[PDB]
Amino acid sequence: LLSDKEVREIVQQSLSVGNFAARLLVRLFPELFTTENLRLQYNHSGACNKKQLDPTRLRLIRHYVEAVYPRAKNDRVWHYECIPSIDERCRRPNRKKCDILKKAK
DNA sequence: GCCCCACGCGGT
DNA sequence: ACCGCGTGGGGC
């Protein structure tokens, strides 16, 4: 639960509605985005042998998304732009692979 | 370096 | 067909 001021401040910095959902994810799930990087054990559905993000916080994220971006009320926009960005955010690595290969030399 | 997003691909 | 992962081109 976060203020209207803070939601609009998040909208200011997000690039697309997918990134709005990703940012609301990071802000609402600060436990997973410490240097512990627990995010790498989670996704939005509980698929691919991974733990499932808090369904109710995810619902709140969708609430804010469909609120700011009304077009998000279609499941075909949430399921196709936000939850892919949410899962990518939870899973994306610290160091890129090719960057790790490049720092070898 | 951080961060975003498109995208081939393999399991379902 | 669909769905999520690993991955890298690339803007900042």
UniProtKB/Swiss-Prot annotation:
Disulphides: none
Compartments, record wording: Nucleus; Nucleus, Nucleolus
Record PTM text: It does not alter association with heterochromatin, but is required for the repression of transcription.
Superkingdom of origin: Eukaryota
BEN domain location: 1-97
Stated role: Transcriptional repressor which associates with the NoRC (nucleolar remodeling complex) complex and plays a key role in repressing rDNA transcription. The sumoylated form modulates the stability of the NoRC complex component BAZ2A/TIP5 by controlling its USP21-mediated deubiquitination. Binds to unmethylated major satellite DNA and is involved in the recruitment of the Polycomb repressive complex 2 (PRC2) to major satellites. Stimulates the ERCC6L translocase and ATPase activities.
Free-text note on domains in this protein's UniProt record: The BEN domain 4 is necessary and sufficient for the localization of BEND3 to heterochromatic regions.
Assembly mode: Homooligomer, probably a homooctamer. Interacts with HDAC2 and HDAC3, but not HDAC1. Interacts with SALL4. Interacts with SMARCA5/SNF2H, BAZ2A/TIP5 and USP21. Interacts with the nucleosome remodeling and histone deacetylase (NuRD) repressor complex. Interacts (via BEN domains 1 and 3) with ERCC6L (via N-terminal TPR repeat); the interaction is direct.
Listed name of the protein: BEN domain-containing protein 3
Organism whose genome encodes this protein: Mus musculus (Mouse)
Lineage: Eukaryota, Metazoa, Chordata, Craniata, Vertebrata
Region of the whole protein represented: 717 to 821 of 825
